[model samples]
Target: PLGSEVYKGDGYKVWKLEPSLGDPLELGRKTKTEMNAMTHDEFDRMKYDKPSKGYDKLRVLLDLMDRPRLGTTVDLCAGRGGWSELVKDLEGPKGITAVSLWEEEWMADPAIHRINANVKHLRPWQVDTLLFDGGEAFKRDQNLRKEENFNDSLLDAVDAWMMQPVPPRNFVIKIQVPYTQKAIALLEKWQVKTGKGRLVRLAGDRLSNTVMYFLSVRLETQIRGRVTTFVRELAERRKDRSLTADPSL
Candidate 1:
């Protein structure tokens, strides 16, 4: 983990204000002054893992979709259960499935039932909120094709969930900016399916290449499948586009 344990206790381990990229106190805002004040305020706040970074992402998610209602919740890449631990205060989580490769203990409470396995093997379940952070997953791919495949496999799980009796109403997908257009297309499709859909990014994304597609997919949903469509369609006006990296990271 990029962050060290700053405050551990009260059933939660706060990692203080840290960032996977850029300086620890230089995220969210660019200027030294703004960045200083920005991190300073959040570092003093409570109930978050990496206070500034994590809380910033959470604020964006909530601003778009309100809160996770009382129902099933899924954390696809639950690194120490930071996002899960923070959001569960709202509701449900009634039943939750936290997935990550490492079986190591989490700062989040044992109330969470974590599965020690690859997220790719886990199919989507009936749930309301799905928490996923692409993080270094795409960056780790040796080439673009495999990168799309990794993402497509993850999207395939979401596509499967679309058919469930309780489809996800909220999806927080943390991906890179270069991939946001494809993500927006998939999220737009899902929005049409739900009759209530929203895909958005946060101001904090400008600090880095990250873009959180909030409130958000299907073969048409697969990152690879979409790429296949685009590559062939460019003749008319086209294009298109997965996975890897330790979830615990």
Candidate 2:
């Protein structure tokens, strides 16, 4: 949604080192230029669907936690499953649950809209298709306050999750930069206030930085100790890592 035109006109443009963004040929040579020309099918199967390298690092970090229950993550503004797949990969051994949030604008195009809609509802496949069921994720205000419908599959994914009697053991929400600041701040404050002992970090390499908030909550602890420990552990483990220079969230 943030760069819709760029995605539609030249999906490659986002990372292609365009002359407009910079000198394409020079940057392309350094990063490896795109091959001559390829069909959308080839790109879709290989390029569009797979997770990015930054997400790969995030997955590795999640694994390092070594929590008992298979951890779950929420990819907040999870445009097209970039980091969601990695969550599944790590969770595969212990059986992890992963969820992603995609706003309507992200699927404004008819083709992308249909593609996204289909993911929310699966059509029973014969073979295992590495997939994550989004199933129309949403959370209503009343539900957020603990109202009707918690365990029903018919409820939107977000609501269904909120409905649970116990807060989920793990979570990772990926919200876009400017838009998700409020929610992101709340989550951080929550980690600190409630003492869930959650860790919040940005994703991606230093240069092509993307704002993502990976939150972890261990069910056993209270607010203060939990968040404090979470912060301490993250600092000790990733002291060398760089984060976007934003303190708002």
Using TM-score, give the best candidate's number: 1
All models: lDDT?
A: 0.48, 0.32
**TM-score, per-candidate, Cα-based:** 0.55, 0.34
lDDT of 1 by residue, 181-232 (tens): 4444555566556655433334323331233353552112333233232222
Which has the greatest lDDT? 1
TM for candidate 2 is 0.34
Tens digits of per-residue lDDT for model 2 on 197-228? 33333322232112223335342323223333
User: How well does model 2 score by local distance difference test?
Assistant: 0.32
lDDT of 1: 0.48
